[PDB]
Amino acid sequence: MQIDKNGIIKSAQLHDKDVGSIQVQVSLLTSQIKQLTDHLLANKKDFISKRGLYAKVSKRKRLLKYLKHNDLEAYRNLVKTLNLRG
Amino acid sequence: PLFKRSKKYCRFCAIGQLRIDLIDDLEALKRFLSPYAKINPRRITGNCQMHQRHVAKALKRARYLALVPFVKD
């Protein structure tokens, strides 16, 4: 099973050519995590992937904190759709 | 002392092959191989590091497909 970066960007874009915002970045990051949790659960001895997984987890948290500091309302819209809290 | 020419040239770079396949230049790789079914070093083979690694992987792959010998004896 693999993902498609093109589809996630077209779905998560707020407006065209916005291929480098925070919403598109975090949506792509969450999708790779789902795939990466699967891979690590299967293997359980690959630690470089674990390091990458931890680093990626931390980046979303910092990114979500920033988007909370500025324009908190858009944070609510993105969080209810993506369902990342829990 | 001794004297000779520093001609030491990477063949594939001039011919720009850019790609090595074991069933496209098989007779070429046998030249790089020493008579003792042994991959010759830099001093003898003359290729650059990149093409030497490429020829080395190809030579070992041919030696797995059982196309070339592995040592005399």
């Binding site: - | 020419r5 001609k7 040239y9 063949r11 001039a14 011919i15 720009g16 092959q17 850019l18 790609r19 090595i20 069933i23 690694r53 490429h54 992987k57 792959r61 030696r63 797995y64 497909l65 059982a66 196309l67 070339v68 010998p69 592995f70």
Partner: protein, 162 residues
């Protein structure tokens, strides 16, 4: 993806080993494109593996999903008529992006034919000479470099106060 198998079968007889290749083709390869095959045929073997030295050599240039490998690989060993099979996935070989790159091919072609004219050289060798053993410096620098030399992108700046 696009894979490349190099199959090995015993040296029994040509048509039946060709026939042997066809079952191995139609059974496995769950999802596949066109399977063009060539016939390197009964070439000598470097060692008596599987108590065999005369083998027919086949190469398959199919393309498909990653699932096309598992069933064929697990059935090859069981089949007593096949000595070896290698699915060399060319997307991981030492150099795959350059062969698809168009301008790279051109410059590669470019490089080979001139070096070859050098090889042809009116009464060239003067002795065995090896492929080269006789290569002069690239004369004066490749002037094309000096002319088509790329100027980087910096910036023009305008004075405001003094």
């Amino acid at each position: 993806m696009q894979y490349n198998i190099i199959l090995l079968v015993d040296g029994s007889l040509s048509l039946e080993q060709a026939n042997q290749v066809n079952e191995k083709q139609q059974q496995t390869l769950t999802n596949v494109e066109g399977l063009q095959t060539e016939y390197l045929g009964l070439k000598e073997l470097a060692y008596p593996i599987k108590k065999q030295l005369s083998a027919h050599y086949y190469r398959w240039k199919f393309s498909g999903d990653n699932q096309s490998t598992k069933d064929f690989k697990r059935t090859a060993n069981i089949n007593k008529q096949v000595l070896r099979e290698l699915i060399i996935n060319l997307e991981r070989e030492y150099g795959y992006l350059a062969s698809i790159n168009p301008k790279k091919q051109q410059l590669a072609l470019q490089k080979r034919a001139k070096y070859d004219e050098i090889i042809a050289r009116e009464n060239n060798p003067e002795n065995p000479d090896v492929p080269v053993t006789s290569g002069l410096a690239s004369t004066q620098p490749r002037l094309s470099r000096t002319e088509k030399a790329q100027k980087p992108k910096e910036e023009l700046w305008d004075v405001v106060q003094k």
